[PDB]
Amino acid sequence: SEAQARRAVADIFNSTLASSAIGAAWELGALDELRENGKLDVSDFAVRHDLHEPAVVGMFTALASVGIVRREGATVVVGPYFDEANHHRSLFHWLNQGSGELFRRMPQVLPNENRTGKFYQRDAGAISYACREISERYFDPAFWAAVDGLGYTPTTVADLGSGSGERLIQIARRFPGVRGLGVDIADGAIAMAEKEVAAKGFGDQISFVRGDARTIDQVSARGEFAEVDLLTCFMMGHDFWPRENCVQTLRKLRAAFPNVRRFLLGDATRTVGIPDRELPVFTLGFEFGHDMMGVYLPTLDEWDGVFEEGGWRCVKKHAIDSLSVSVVFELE
Amino acid sequence: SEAQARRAVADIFNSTLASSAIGAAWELGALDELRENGKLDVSDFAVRHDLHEPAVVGMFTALASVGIVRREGATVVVGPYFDEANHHRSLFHWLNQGSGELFRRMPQVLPNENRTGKFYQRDAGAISYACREISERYFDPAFWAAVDGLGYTPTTVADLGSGSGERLIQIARRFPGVRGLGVDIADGAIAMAEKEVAAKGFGDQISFVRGDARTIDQVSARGEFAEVDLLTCFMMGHDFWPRENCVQTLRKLRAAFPNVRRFLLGDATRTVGIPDRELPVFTLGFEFGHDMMGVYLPTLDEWDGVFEEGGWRCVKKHAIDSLSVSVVFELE
Numbered sequence: 001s002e003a004q005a006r007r008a009v010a011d012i013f014n015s016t017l018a019s020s021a022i023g024a025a026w027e028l029g030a031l032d033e034l035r036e037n038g039k040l041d042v043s044d045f046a047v048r049h050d051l052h053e054p055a056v057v058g059m060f061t062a063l064a065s066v067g068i069v070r071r072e073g074a075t076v077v078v079g080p081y082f083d084e085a086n087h088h089r090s091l092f093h094w095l096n097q098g099s100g101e102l103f104r105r106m107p108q109v110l111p112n113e114n115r116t117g118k119f120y121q122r123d124a125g126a127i128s129y130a131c132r133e134i135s136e137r138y139f140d141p142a143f144w145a146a147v148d149g150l151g152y153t154p155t156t157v158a159d160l161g162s163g164s165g166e167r168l169i170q171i172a173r174r175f176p177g178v179r180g181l182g183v184d185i186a187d188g189a190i191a192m193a194e195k196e197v198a199a200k201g202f203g204d205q206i207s208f209v210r211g212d213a214r215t216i217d218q219v220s221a222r223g224e225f226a227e228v229d230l231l232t233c234f235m236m237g238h239d240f241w242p243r244e245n246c247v248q249t250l251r252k253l254r255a256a257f258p259n260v261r262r263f264l265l266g267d268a269t270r271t272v273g274i275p276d277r278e279l280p281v282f283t284l285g286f287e288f289g290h291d292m293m294g295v296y297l298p299t300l301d302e303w304d305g306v307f308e309e310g311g312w313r314c315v316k317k318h319a320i321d322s323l324s325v326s327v328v329f330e331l332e
Numbered sequence: 333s334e335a336q337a338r339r340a341v342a343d344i345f346n347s348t349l350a351s352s353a354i355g356a357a358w359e360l361g362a363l364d365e366l367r368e369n370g371k372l373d374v375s376d377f378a379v380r381h382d383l384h385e386p387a388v389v390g391m392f393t394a395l396a397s398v399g400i401v402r403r404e405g406a407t408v409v410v411g412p413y414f415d416e417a418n419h420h421r422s423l424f425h426w427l428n429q430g431s432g433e434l435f436r437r438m439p440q441v442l443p444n445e446n447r448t449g450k451f452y453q454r455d456a457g458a459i460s461y462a463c464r465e466i467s468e469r470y471f472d473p474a475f476w477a478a479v480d481g482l483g484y485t486p487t488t489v490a491d492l493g494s495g496s497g498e499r500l501i502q503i504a505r506r507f508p509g510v511r512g513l514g515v516d517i518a519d520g521a522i523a524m525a526e527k528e529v530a531a532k533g534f535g536d537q538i539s540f541v542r543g544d545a546r547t548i549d550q551v552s553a554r555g556e557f558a559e560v561d562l563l564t565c566f567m568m569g570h571d572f573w574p575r576e577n578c579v580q581t582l583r584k585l586r587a588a589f590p591n592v593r594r595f596l597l598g599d600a601t602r603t604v605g606i607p608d609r610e611l612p613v614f615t616l617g618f619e620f621g622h623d624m625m626g627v628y629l630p631t632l633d634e635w636d637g638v639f640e641e642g643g644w645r646c647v648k649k650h651a652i653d654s655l656s657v658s659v660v661f662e663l664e
């Protein structure tokens with residue numbers, strides 16, 4: 001009936017603002033406060049954080065509009081969907097705060113004659129803020145299970161796409177005096193990681209180099225690569241694709257890190273045959289987004305069928321619970 | 333249950349993409365082809381509009397993910413929620429294509445520390461694009477009803493926030509002997525109005541001037557102002573507020589258009605006391621967006637209470653269906 005349609009459309013409209021508020025509420029500290037305390041006071045929160053209170057009221061209202069919170073007086077309370085939304089909060093951030101400009105510009109991005117040069121913008125800073133927690137909450141457990149079953153003690157580890165440095169820091173903690181090499185394409189990340197490494201006492205163990213897995217052989221730290229016996233690479237596998245570029249990069253990595261014994265490669269992958277009305281969280285946004293950026297996403301099976309050609313043998317594999325279909329390969 | 337919360341949060345995620353896809357689908361022709369024919373061929377559609385098909389498949393998938401269309405092989409077919417979504421497409425467009433940058437930047441915008449200068453940004457062309465259908469779809473019935481019941485035939489009409497100039501062209505169509513007079517703030521919104529009026533052939537009838545109602549005493553082509561016997565102002569009244577400013581701006585219009593007989597004033601207002609889970613479409617976005625923008629938004633009762641002090645007398649009032657709580661006042 002028409003009343004059902006009004007309601008469902010209104011919900012779509014309001015989910016939009018709830019969606020954008022989920023990641024905002026996270027960044028601003030609201031969700032955390034709500035998880036500990038079950039309850040908060042809007043004004044008191046606004047004063048403490050020094051936020052424009054009429055906008056704060058809207059934020060929670062947006063969240064309340066779809067049952068993530070409940071409002072009673074000037075009090076906001078966790079609602080029936082608080083845990084699900086909060087569990088997945090960094091995905092909403094990725095979607096909105098990170099990638100909001102891409103989806104906004106849909107009528108501009110879809111036309112073929114616009115799809116040349118740099119044809120879309122995203123907030124690089126926002127993306128790395130969400131990708132941090134995305135790595136931690138979704139990929140880490142499997143990353144550690146892979147490390148748990150290496151069958152040897154690494155002496156030198158390289159991490160492709162090292163971001164903030166935290167993965168190499170945790171590795172140094174696991175294996176006290178291991179050396180670390182982080183490869184990152186971004187100068188901001190490098191400086192940040194050098195600072196954070198230094199901050200935690202590892203300046204002497206962990207160093208960073210500017211670069212891309214895809215041109216890893218042109219990198220001037222190349223002579224340090226012979227020492228590396230563990231290789232890691234999370235959340236950028238798909239950017240090695242198309243398939244023939246992937247084969248090339250994998251071979252380049254094989255040759256440049258000849259003494260690597262295990263290479264842990266983690267990423268999300270493209271799903272097949274999920275029906276339109278049962279699509280889980282993230283999946284459509286991840287997939288639709290990369291199609292909008294004209295970036296191909298392999299499936300699990302496509303990864304499976306590229307390793308040997310790329311010069312690697314896959315010896316273990318771990319599914320992620322649950323971020324579309326995501327996986328950690330162990331290669332050798 | 334845990335399964336229900338999973339499904340709900342996924343729908344909130346997917347509704348974000350669907351929401352954005354509604355305004356995109358409209359701008360790109362898909363909603364119109366769908367409403368005409370009930371179905372379309374995604375490949376043909378992609379070909380006809382020269383669009384990147386995989387991203388087009390993404391848009392229709394977003395829209396299907398929440399019941400707006402159904403995908404059937406290569407065909408997209410209207411869904412149960414289509415009539416309602418299509419009806420409000422310009423509201424979704426406003427939220428996303430128009431105002432997406434505001435809501436995206438929620439964590440940068442809410443902190444008082446960053447609320448100086450030009451601290452948010454929206455897509456002015458996208459906004460005016462939607463606002464043309466908002467006007468025509470939600471305000472026109474009332475607007476023409478008001479005009480049908482004036483008790484006089486206007487000789488010269490002044491439209492504040494003339495936008496495209498389309499309001500004035502219709503007036504001209506209706507009253508061939510009439511003198512149009514657009515007053516917009518944008519020197520280049522004038523331009524595409526002037527050349528467009530001209531291009532359709534109303535150039536001796538409708539002329540245009542830069543100006544802002546709020547500072548209407550300071551305008552530089554007042555030649556025609558004493559001749560204006562009908563004044564219109566749509567979708568911008570709330571910009572006159574807070575109250576004292578509104579009193580002043582109303583007085584200033586009174587003194588500047590001293591032979592105006594009726595002043596038609598149309599706007600959306602702030603609702604009161606609607607339960608968080610029964611919010612209808614648009615309301616939260618209008619209200620939350622303006623709070624985020626630092627823009628005062630009056631209730632129906634606040635408007636009611638201000639006109640006499642503003643030097644006007646409210647003789648008629650029209651409810652709109654249903655753009656939240658929207659109204660058209662007739663003042664003399």
Ligand SMILES: O=C(O)C(=O)Cc1ccc(O)cc1
Pocket residue numbers: 127131134235236267268323326
């Ligand atoms: O932003 C992009 O292009 C990404 O691909 C980020 C990404 C990669 C893998 C994930 O599991 C989640 C996010």
Ligand SMILES: O=C(O)C(=O)Cc1ccc(O)cc1
Pocket residue numbers: 459466567568599600655658
């Ligand atoms: O974008 C804004 O600030 C608006 O105020 C637009 C607007 C104003 C009134 C309406 O009834 C619908 C949209």
Ligand SMILES: O=C(O)[C@H](O)Cc1ccc(O)cc1
Pocket residue numbers: 303304305307314315316317329
């Ligand atoms: O083909 C695959 O399944 C993966 O690429 C990695 C893999 C392959 C074979 C195994 O026995 C375990 C893991």
Ligand SMILES: O=C(O)[C@H](O)Cc1ccc(O)cc1
Pocket residue numbers: 635636637639646647648649661
């Ligand atoms: O006070 C109001 O409701 C409005 O200002 C307009 C109005 C006021 C009195 C009337 O008799 C009819 C309309």
Ligand SMILES: [Ca+2]
Pocket residue numbers: 039040041075
């Ligand atoms: Ca409290």
Ligand SMILES: [Ca+2]
Pocket residue numbers: 078079080
């Ligand atoms: Ca509950």
Ligand SMILES: [Ca+2]
Pocket residue numbers: 101121122123
């Ligand atoms: Ca951006």
Ligand SMILES: [Ca+2]
Pocket residue numbers: 300301304
């Ligand atoms: Ca396989």
Ligand SMILES: [Ca+2]
Pocket residue numbers: 371372373407
């Ligand atoms: Ca067809």
Ligand SMILES: [Ca+2]
Pocket residue numbers: 433453454455
């Ligand atoms: Ca913008």
Ligand SMILES: [Ca+2]
Pocket residue numbers: 485506507508509510
């Ligand atoms: Ca006439």
Ligand SMILES: [Ca+2]
Pocket residue numbers: 575576579
């Ligand atoms: Ca006052």
Ligand SMILES: [Ca+2]
Pocket residue numbers: 006007010610611612613
């Ligand atoms: Ca409704």
Ligand SMILES: [Fe+3]
Pocket residue numbers: 238239290295
């Ligand atoms: Fe990517």
Ligand SMILES: [Fe+3]
Pocket residue numbers: 568570571622627
């Ligand atoms: Fe406004």
